[PDB]
Symmetry: C2
Subunit: 168 residues, 2 copies
Amino acid sequence: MQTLIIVAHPELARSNTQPFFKAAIENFSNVTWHPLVADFNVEQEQSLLLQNDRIILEFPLYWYSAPALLKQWMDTVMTTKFATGHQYALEGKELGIVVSTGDNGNAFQAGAAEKFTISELMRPFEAFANKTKMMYLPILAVHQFLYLEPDAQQRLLVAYQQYATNVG
Amino acid sequence: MQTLIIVAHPELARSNTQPFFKAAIENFSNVTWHPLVADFNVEQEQSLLLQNDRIILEFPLYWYSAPALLKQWMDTVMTTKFATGHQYALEGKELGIVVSTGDNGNAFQAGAAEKFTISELMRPFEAFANKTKMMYLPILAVHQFLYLEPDAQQRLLVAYQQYATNVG
Protein backbone atom coordinates (compact mmCIF):
# COMPACT_ATOMS: atom_id res chain seq x y z
CA MET A 1 0.00 0.00 0.00
CA GLN A 2 1.34 3.42 -1.00
CA THR A 3 0.67 6.34 1.37
CA LEU A 4 0.87 10.02 0.43
CA ILE A 5 1.07 12.48 3.32
CA ILE A 6 0.12 15.98 2.24
CA VAL A 7 1.74 18.24 4.82
CA ALA A 8 0.10 21.65 4.85
CA HIS A 9 1.70 23.82 7.52
CA PRO A 10 2.31 27.40 6.27
CA GLU A 11 5.30 27.66 8.67
CA LEU A 12 6.59 24.07 8.61
CA ALA A 13 10.22 24.89 9.42
CA ARG A 14 9.07 26.62 12.65
CA SER A 15 6.71 23.80 13.69
CA ASN A 16 7.86 21.93 16.80
CA THR A 17 5.24 19.23 16.50
CA GLN A 18 5.92 18.14 12.90
CA PRO A 19 9.63 17.09 13.42
CA PHE A 20 8.58 14.20 15.73
CA PHE A 21 6.13 13.13 13.06
CA LYS A 22 8.44 13.07 10.03
CA ALA A 23 10.93 11.07 12.12
CA ALA A 24 8.23 8.46 12.87
CA ILE A 25 7.67 7.58 9.16
CA GLU A 26 11.13 8.28 7.63
CA ASN A 27 11.91 4.56 7.44
CA PHE A 28 8.74 3.47 5.62
CA SER A 29 9.66 3.39 1.93
CA ASN A 30 5.99 3.14 0.88
CA VAL A 31 5.24 6.49 2.56
CA THR A 32 5.72 9.69 0.58
CA TRP A 33 6.09 12.71 2.81
CA HIS A 34 5.02 15.71 0.76
CA PRO A 35 5.05 19.25 2.19
CA LEU A 36 3.20 21.82 0.06
CA VAL A 37 4.70 25.05 -1.28
CA ALA A 38 2.39 28.04 -1.90
CA ASP A 39 3.03 27.72 -5.66
CA PHE A 40 2.49 23.95 -5.93
CA ASN A 41 2.06 22.45 -9.39
CA VAL A 42 -1.45 21.04 -10.08
CA GLU A 43 -0.34 18.35 -12.54
CA GLN A 44 2.35 17.18 -10.10
CA GLU A 45 -0.17 17.07 -7.24
CA GLN A 46 -2.64 15.07 -9.38
CA SER A 47 0.15 12.69 -10.48
CA LEU A 48 1.06 11.98 -6.82
CA LEU A 49 -2.58 11.33 -5.90
CA LEU A 50 -2.85 8.80 -8.73
CA GLN A 51 0.23 6.94 -7.49
CA ASN A 52 -1.01 6.47 -3.93
CA ASP A 53 -3.65 4.41 -2.13
CA ARG A 54 -4.02 6.22 1.20
CA ILE A 55 -4.03 9.99 1.14
CA ILE A 56 -3.44 11.65 4.49
CA LEU A 57 -3.96 15.38 4.98
CA GLU A 58 -1.71 16.66 7.74
CA PHE A 59 -2.22 20.15 9.20
CA PRO A 60 -2.64 22.40 12.25
CA LEU A 61 -6.16 23.46 13.22
CA TYR A 62 -6.42 27.17 12.38
CA TRP A 63 -9.75 28.68 13.59
CA TYR A 64 -11.42 25.24 13.56
CA SER A 65 -10.38 24.45 9.99
CA ALA A 66 -7.40 23.59 7.77
CA PRO A 67 -4.93 26.41 6.89
CA ALA A 68 -5.41 28.44 3.72
CA LEU A 69 -2.54 26.53 2.01
CA LEU A 70 -4.51 23.26 2.20
CA LYS A 71 -7.73 24.98 1.13
CA GLN A 72 -5.96 26.30 -1.96
CA TRP A 73 -4.68 22.80 -2.76
CA MET A 74 -8.23 21.45 -2.40
CA ASP A 75 -9.75 24.16 -4.63
CA THR A 76 -7.16 23.94 -7.43
CA VAL A 77 -5.96 20.28 -7.43
CA MET A 78 -9.41 18.75 -6.90
CA THR A 79 -11.05 19.97 -10.08
CA THR A 80 -14.47 18.72 -11.16
CA LYS A 81 -12.78 17.04 -14.14
CA PHE A 82 -10.27 15.08 -12.01
CA ALA A 83 -12.07 14.38 -8.72
CA THR A 84 -15.60 13.85 -10.11
CA GLY A 85 -16.91 14.36 -13.66
CA HIS A 86 -16.13 11.20 -15.63
CA GLN A 87 -12.78 10.38 -14.03
CA TYR A 88 -13.43 10.07 -10.26
CA ALA A 89 -9.67 9.71 -9.93
CA LEU A 90 -9.80 9.18 -6.16
CA GLU A 91 -12.51 6.50 -6.10
CA GLY A 92 -11.66 3.73 -3.63
CA LYS A 93 -8.64 5.51 -2.16
CA GLU A 94 -8.64 6.15 1.61
CA LEU A 95 -8.68 9.66 3.05
CA GLY A 96 -7.16 10.27 6.46
CA ILE A 97 -6.72 13.43 8.52
CA VAL A 98 -3.88 14.16 10.99
CA VAL A 99 -5.01 17.39 12.65
CA SER A 100 -3.07 19.02 15.47
CA THR A 101 -4.39 21.51 18.04
CA GLY A 102 -2.91 23.22 21.11
CA ASP A 103 -6.21 22.65 22.96
CA ASN A 104 -7.07 19.75 25.26
CA GLY A 105 -9.06 17.11 23.36
CA ASN A 106 -11.71 17.23 26.08
CA ALA A 107 -12.64 20.77 24.98
CA PHE A 108 -14.06 19.37 21.72
CA GLN A 109 -17.45 17.96 22.73
CA ALA A 110 -20.98 19.05 23.65
CA GLY A 111 -21.09 20.92 27.01
CA ALA A 112 -17.36 21.64 26.89
CA ALA A 113 -15.59 24.86 25.85
CA GLU A 114 -15.59 24.32 22.05
CA LYS A 115 -19.08 22.69 21.96
CA PHE A 116 -18.26 20.60 18.85
CA THR A 117 -16.30 17.38 18.32
CA ILE A 118 -13.38 17.07 15.91
CA SER A 119 -15.65 14.80 13.76
CA GLU A 120 -18.12 17.67 13.39
CA LEU A 121 -15.45 20.25 12.59
CA MET A 122 -13.87 17.99 9.95
CA ARG A 123 -17.22 17.50 8.15
CA PRO A 124 -16.08 19.34 4.97
CA PHE A 125 -13.43 16.62 4.47
CA GLU A 126 -15.94 13.86 5.14
CA ALA A 127 -18.28 15.44 2.58
CA PHE A 128 -15.38 15.55 0.14
CA ALA A 129 -14.58 11.85 0.65
CA ASN A 130 -18.25 10.94 0.10
CA LYS A 131 -18.47 13.06 -3.05
CA THR A 132 -15.29 11.63 -4.54
CA LYS A 133 -16.10 8.06 -3.46
CA MET A 134 -13.09 7.79 -1.16
CA MET A 135 -13.13 5.71 2.02
CA TYR A 136 -12.97 8.15 5.01
CA LEU A 137 -10.79 6.96 7.90
CA PRO A 138 -11.35 7.84 11.54
CA ILE A 139 -9.53 11.13 12.17
CA LEU A 140 -6.19 11.15 13.97
CA ALA A 141 -6.47 14.20 16.25
CA VAL A 142 -3.23 15.34 17.88
CA HIS A 143 -3.99 17.43 20.97
CA GLN A 144 -1.38 19.45 22.95
CA PHE A 145 1.51 17.36 21.69
CA LEU A 146 4.29 19.67 22.93
CA TYR A 147 2.84 19.74 26.46
CA LEU A 148 2.68 15.92 26.74
CA GLU A 149 5.17 13.73 28.62
CA PRO A 150 7.69 11.63 26.59
CA ASP A 151 5.66 8.38 26.97
CA ALA A 152 2.39 10.03 25.95
CA GLN A 153 4.19 11.57 22.96
CA GLN A 154 5.57 8.14 21.96
CA ARG A 155 2.10 6.53 22.02
CA LEU A 156 0.74 9.16 19.62
CA LEU A 157 3.78 8.70 17.39
CA VAL A 158 3.07 4.94 17.26
CA ALA A 159 -0.59 5.69 16.38
CA TYR A 160 0.63 7.96 13.60
CA GLN A 161 2.95 5.25 12.23
CA GLN A 162 0.00 2.86 12.11
CA TYR A 163 -2.22 5.55 10.52
CA ALA A 164 0.28 5.84 7.67
CA THR A 165 1.20 2.19 7.17
CA ASN A 166 -1.34 -0.24 8.61
CA VAL A 167 -3.37 -1.85 5.81
CA GLY A 168 -5.82 -0.36 5.33
CA MET B 1 -25.78 49.86 13.14
CA GLN B 2 -22.90 49.64 10.72
CA THR B 3 -22.46 46.51 8.58
CA LEU B 4 -19.31 45.26 6.89
CA ILE B 5 -19.69 42.79 4.03
CA ILE B 6 -16.48 40.83 3.36
CA VAL B 7 -16.88 39.74 -0.25
CA ALA B 8 -14.64 36.74 -0.74
CA HIS B 9 -15.47 35.64 -4.26
CA PRO B 10 -12.08 34.56 -5.69
CA GLU B 11 -12.83 35.82 -9.21
CA LEU B 12 -15.01 38.80 -8.30
CA ALA B 13 -14.47 40.71 -11.58
CA ARG B 14 -15.94 37.74 -13.49
CA SER B 15 -18.76 36.81 -11.06
CA ASN B 16 -22.28 37.02 -12.52
CA THR B 17 -23.99 36.75 -9.11
CA GLN B 18 -22.15 39.35 -7.02
CA PRO B 19 -23.17 42.48 -8.94
CA PHE B 20 -26.79 41.61 -8.01
CA PHE B 21 -25.89 41.64 -4.30
CA LYS B 22 -23.74 44.77 -4.53
CA ALA B 23 -26.56 46.57 -6.34
CA ALA B 24 -29.03 45.44 -3.66
CA ILE B 25 -27.23 47.26 -0.83
CA GLU B 26 -25.88 50.21 -2.86
CA ASN B 27 -28.38 52.59 -1.28
CA PHE B 28 -27.68 51.76 2.38
CA SER B 29 -24.93 54.15 3.51
CA ASN B 30 -24.32 52.16 6.73
CA VAL B 31 -23.43 49.03 4.70
CA THR B 32 -19.81 48.72 3.49
CA TRP B 33 -19.21 46.48 0.47
CA HIS B 34 -15.63 45.25 0.97
CA PRO B 35 -14.05 43.02 -1.65
CA LEU B 36 -11.31 40.80 -0.28
CA VAL B 37 -8.19 41.32 -2.40
CA ALA B 38 -5.23 38.94 -2.64
CA ASP B 39 -2.95 41.58 -1.11
CA PHE B 40 -5.15 42.69 1.82
CA ASN B 41 -3.53 44.63 4.66
CA VAL B 42 -4.09 43.29 8.19
CA GLU B 43 -4.21 46.71 9.89
CA GLN B 44 -6.78 48.08 7.40
CA GLU B 45 -8.90 44.92 7.70
CA GLN B 46 -8.75 45.11 11.52
CA SER B 47 -9.70 48.78 11.31
CA LEU B 48 -12.80 47.95 9.26
CA LEU B 49 -13.84 45.24 11.73
CA LEU B 50 -13.51 47.62 14.68
CA GLN B 51 -15.71 50.19 12.90
CA ASN B 52 -18.60 47.79 12.22
CA ASP B 53 -21.26 46.04 14.34
CA ARG B 54 -22.39 43.30 11.97
CA ILE B 55 -19.80 41.42 9.95
CA ILE B 56 -21.04 39.34 7.05
CA LEU B 57 -18.79 36.90 5.22
CA GLU B 58 -20.01 36.47 1.67
CA PHE B 59 -18.55 33.64 -0.40
CA PRO B 60 -19.17 30.68 -2.74
CA LEU B 61 -19.02 27.20 -1.27
CA TYR B 62 -15.86 25.46 -2.58
CA TRP B 63 -15.59 21.79 -1.51
CA TYR B 64 -18.01 22.36 1.38
CA SER B 65 -16.04 25.32 2.82
CA ALA B 66 -14.92 28.91 2.24
CA PRO B 67 -12.45 29.77 -0.59
CA ALA B 68 -8.78 29.86 0.35
CA LEU B 69 -8.51 33.69 0.25
CA LEU B 70 -11.17 33.96 2.98
CA LYS B 71 -9.39 31.31 5.05
CA GLN B 72 -6.15 33.29 4.60
CA TRP B 73 -7.92 36.43 5.88
CA MET B 74 -9.21 34.48 8.89
CA ASP B 75 -5.71 33.05 9.58
CA THR B 76 -3.91 36.41 9.31
CA VAL B 77 -6.38 39.16 10.31
CA MET B 78 -7.91 37.21 13.20
CA THR B 79 -4.85 36.95 15.41
CA THR B 80 -4.86 35.68 19.00
CA LYS B 81 -3.89 39.23 20.10
CA PHE B 82 -6.79 40.87 18.24
CA ALA B 83 -9.66 38.36 18.23
CA THR B 84 -8.98 36.81 21.66
CA GLY B 85 -6.02 37.38 24.05
CA HIS B 86 -6.70 40.40 26.23
CA GLN B 87 -8.60 42.35 23.56
CA TYR B 88 -11.48 40.21 22.20
CA ALA B 89 -11.97 42.94 19.60
CA LEU B 90 -15.08 41.29 18.15
CA GLU B 91 -17.00 40.81 21.41
CA GLY B 92 -20.70 41.66 20.96
CA LYS B 93 -20.51 42.01 17.15
CA GLU B 94 -22.78 39.85 14.99
CA LEU B 95 -21.31 37.36 12.52
CA GLY B 96 -23.35 36.51 9.42
CA ILE B 97 -22.67 34.21 6.49
CA VAL B 98 -23.99 34.64 2.94
CA VAL B 99 -22.91 31.37 1.29
CA SER B 100 -23.73 30.60 -2.33
CA THR B 101 -23.81 27.16 -3.94
CA GLY B 102 -24.38 25.82 -7.47
CA ASP B 103 -26.22 22.86 -5.91
CA ASN B 104 -29.91 22.60 -5.08
CA GLY B 105 -30.58 23.41 -1.41
CA ASN B 106 -32.35 20.06 -1.06
CA ALA B 107 -29.06 18.11 -1.50
CA PHE B 108 -27.83 19.43 1.88
CA GLN B 109 -29.64 17.24 4.41
CA ALA B 110 -29.52 13.76 5.89
CA GLY B 111 -30.50 11.07 3.36
CA ALA B 112 -29.85 13.36 0.37
CA ALA B 113 -26.81 13.55 -1.93
CA GLU B 114 -24.61 15.68 0.38
CA LYS B 115 -25.74 14.11 3.70
CA PHE B 116 -25.02 17.30 5.72
CA THR B 117 -26.89 20.55 6.16
CA ILE B 118 -25.39 23.97 5.51
CA SER B 119 -25.59 24.54 9.29
CA GLU B 120 -23.33 21.54 9.89
CA LEU B 121 -20.86 22.56 7.17
CA MET B 122 -20.53 26.11 8.51
CA ARG B 123 -19.65 24.83 12.01
CA PRO B 124 -16.10 26.24 11.94
CA PHE B 125 -17.59 29.77 11.65
CA GLU B 126 -20.01 29.10 14.46
CA ALA B 127 -17.11 27.92 16.63
CA PHE B 128 -15.16 31.07 15.68
CA ALA B 129 -18.10 33.25 16.70
CA ASN B 130 -18.43 31.36 20.00
CA LYS B 131 -14.70 31.71 20.70
CA THR B 132 -14.55 35.42 19.93
CA LYS B 133 -17.79 36.20 21.85
CA MET B 134 -19.69 37.21 18.70
CA MET B 135 -23.40 36.61 18.11
CA TYR B 136 -23.83 34.05 15.30
CA LEU B 137 -26.75 34.87 12.99
CA PRO B 138 -28.75 32.27 11.09
CA ILE B 139 -26.90 31.58 7.81
CA LEU B 140 -28.20 33.06 4.54
CA ALA B 141 -27.73 30.17 2.07
CA VAL B 142 -28.06 31.12 -1.60
CA HIS B 143 -28.63 28.10 -3.84
CA GLN B 144 -28.36 28.37 -7.67
CA PHE B 145 -29.01 32.11 -7.66
CA LEU B 146 -28.52 32.59 -11.40
CA TYR B 147 -30.97 29.77 -12.21
CA LEU B 148 -33.84 31.16 -10.08
CA GLU B 149 -36.85 32.78 -11.76
CA PRO B 150 -36.65 36.60 -11.77
CA ASP B 151 -39.31 36.76 -8.99
CA ALA B 152 -37.44 34.33 -6.73
CA GLN B 153 -34.19 36.23 -7.44
CA GLN B 154 -35.89 39.44 -6.30
CA ARG B 155 -37.25 37.81 -3.08
CA LEU B 156 -33.85 36.46 -2.14
CA LEU B 157 -32.35 39.93 -2.71
CA VAL B 158 -34.90 41.46 -0.26
CA ALA B 159 -33.93 38.82 2.33
CA TYR B 160 -30.31 39.82 1.66
CA GLN B 161 -31.11 43.51 2.26
CA GLN B 162 -32.79 42.60 5.58
CA TYR B 163 -29.85 40.35 6.47
CA ALA B 164 -27.46 43.29 6.00
CA THR B 165 -29.58 46.02 7.65
CA ASN B 166 -32.42 44.69 9.81
CA VAL B 167 -31.24 45.79 13.23
CA GLY B 168 -33.60 43.33 15.00
